[PDB]
Amino acid sequence: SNATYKVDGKGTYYKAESASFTANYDIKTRLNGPFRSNPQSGVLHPGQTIKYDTVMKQDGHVWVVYTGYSGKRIYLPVRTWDKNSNTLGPLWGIIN
Numbered sequence: 692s693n694a695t696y697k698v699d700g701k702g703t704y705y706k707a708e709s710a711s712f713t714a715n716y717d718i719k720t721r722l723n724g725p726f727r728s729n730p731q732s733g734v735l736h737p738g739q740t741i742k743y744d745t746v747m748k749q750d751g752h753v754w755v756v757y758t759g760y761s762g763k764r765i766y767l768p769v770r771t772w773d774k775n776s777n778t779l780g781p782l783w784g785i786i787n
């Protein structure tokens with residue numbers, strides 16, 4: 692629920708959460724922060740799994756955050772999120 696998140700200076704809600712996410716779709720990943728207008732890091736293809744450490748809610752989505760090989764932080768949207776209602780869309784993959 693929202694009660695477990697903190698909020699940063701851009702209004703992004705965030706918390707620590709460690710799990711694995713396997714994509715069921717091609718999902719574009721971002722650099723710099725959880726905004727689709729940010730530079731594109733690349734994509735998860737269906738069946739690819741990443742291990743994340745932080746969850747955020749910003750720019751209409753729930754995102755998870757992980758570190759790439761070079762140490763770049765990569766922001767992956769995993770479902771839609773409506774800020775005013777906290778309503779979540781279906782997950783774009785599997786969490787385990």
Ligand SMILES: N=C(N)NOCC[C@H](N)C(=O)O
Pocket residue numbers: 693694695696697698
């Ligand atoms: N939403 C802000 N400003 N900070 O996040 C923490 C708020 C805390 N869970 C509370 O409910 O008071």
